[PDB]
Amino acid sequence: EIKSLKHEIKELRKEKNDTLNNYDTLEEETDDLKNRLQALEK
Amino acid sequence: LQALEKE
């Protein structure tokens, strides 16, 4: 039953990797809007 | 950004 628990933990890791991909696209959007902020300020 | 597009 330990292998099933490890598989469930790997599924949780996959879900968190999906959240990390969401974080990465959020980060690229943040970089784009930071460039926009710097362009509109200067 | 909105501020920089509000003024």
Side-chain angles (χ1 to χ4, degrees), chain A residues 1-41, chain B residues 1-5:
Chain A
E1 71 282 345
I2 307 91
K3 321 300 165 300
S4 198
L5 172 143
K6 294 176 180 175
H7 172 56
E8 295 160 3
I9 295 314
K10 286 184 300 182
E11 295 165 345
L12 293 181
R13 292 157 182 171
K14 183 57 184 63
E15 301 164 3
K16 264 68 177 180
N17 184 27
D18 304 330
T19 75
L20 279 172
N21 305 331
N22 199 337
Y23 175 87
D24 296 321
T25 177
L26 186 61
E27 180 74 41
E28 68 88 21
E29 170 207 359
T30 310
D31 296 0
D32 297 315
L33 55 84
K34 280 173 181 176
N35 302 140
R36 280 188 48 186
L37 268 180
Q38 291 160 350
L40 283 179
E41 284 304 347
Chain B
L1 286 174
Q2 304 169 358
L4 285 189
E5 84 187 6

